[PDB]
Structures are given as C-alpha cells and as structure tokens.
C-alpha cells in the first residue's frame, strides 16, 4: 500500500506522504508485537529440551 501510492517519494513537492509514513509506522510496531507474541506462543508445550 505504501509502494503503490501515486506521488514520487524523492520529491518534497507533495509533502503529504508524511501522514502515510506515520501510518506505516504503527502497523510496523503492530507487526513487531505480533512476532513477539509468536515467539511467546509456539513454546507453550515442547516435546524435548533439545529440539526446542
């Protein structure tokens, strides 16, 4: 969705992507916390010490 937007990124002639980037920055941290839950969530029962 970020890499389909009409404006050229290198141009400061638009200066409206500064809301797209600060919307991007919240679902990146959402992705972060999702992966943190993923690590916390696939180790609840492990068959061996060694495999896990």
């Amino acid at each position: 969705d970020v890499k389909r937007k009409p404006y050229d990124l290198l141009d400061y002639s638009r200066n409206a992507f500064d809301t797209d980037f600060l919307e991007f920055n919240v679902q990146i941290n959402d992705l972060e916390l999702q992966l943190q839950g993923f690590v916390n969530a696939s180790f609840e029962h492990i068959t061996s010490t060694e495999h896990a």
Partner: protein, 157 residues
Amino acid sequence: AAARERYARKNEQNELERAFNTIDSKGDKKIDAEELTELFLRLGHKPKRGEVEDMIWEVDEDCDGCISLLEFQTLYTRCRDDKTGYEPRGLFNVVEFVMNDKNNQGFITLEEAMQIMYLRYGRAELDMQLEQVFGTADLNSGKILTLTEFLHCLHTN
C-alpha cells in the same frame, strides 16, 4: 483502530522520567506552583498573572491540599484516557510541550504526532489548531501552544 497509544506510552515512560526530573526545581516528588513559576523562568517567558491557580478552579476539586508525584502520575493518566467529553486539561499541556521540546526553544512540525495518536484524519484536525505549511510551518513556544489549546477548549465549549 486503537493501535496508537501503545508505542506512544511504552517509550513515553522514559522521557516522562527526566521530564518530571528537569521540570521540578528541587528535583523532588512534590509539585507546587513555585516550581511552576521557576520553570516558567527556565522557559524564559512571562507567565500570566493567574497561572498560580489556573489548574484548580473547575478541575482540581475532588482531591485536596498540595499535589505531588502521586497527583502528577494521577493527572498524567487523565489525558489519553478521556474522550470528546470535555476534559480537565490544566497543567498537562506545558509538560507536553516540554517533553516535545527537544531544542530548548520550542519545536516545529511535530504536533501532527499529537493529532495522529489523537486521530487518523485529514488536515482538518491540524487546520483548526494551527496552519502548519509543510515547507516551513512556524517556530513555536509555550505561549502559542497553551493559548491555542486553551482557546480551542473554550471554543468547543
């Protein structure tokens, strides 16, 4: 929808630490209006002549006496939690400016942070408050920020 507050708050705790440190004149847990006035001298402006009691009339009524860090961390909750129902916004906004002040003068073009965690919306939310031109917006101080927010609280009333 409500993803905004999390990564605000988690980093916000650390800057809240030295914010409350450098705000306090004696560097202690107790908070008085003398600390307020000497901090306004640290900003170097001239506070208005009712600023001693400007946070107490309609808003700081349920509790009593002198406030401290207990009251500080109480009222620091009182900002993000509340809704479009009109809020007690008395002493926070100067602290919000101060921790958003990382150039010892004011700031540029960072209020859109304080509206994006407020709301995802177009430039209307900005345009009611100020008129930040994206090339160069303005240079800010505590006077402009406090007057604009107080005027908008009165205007929405």
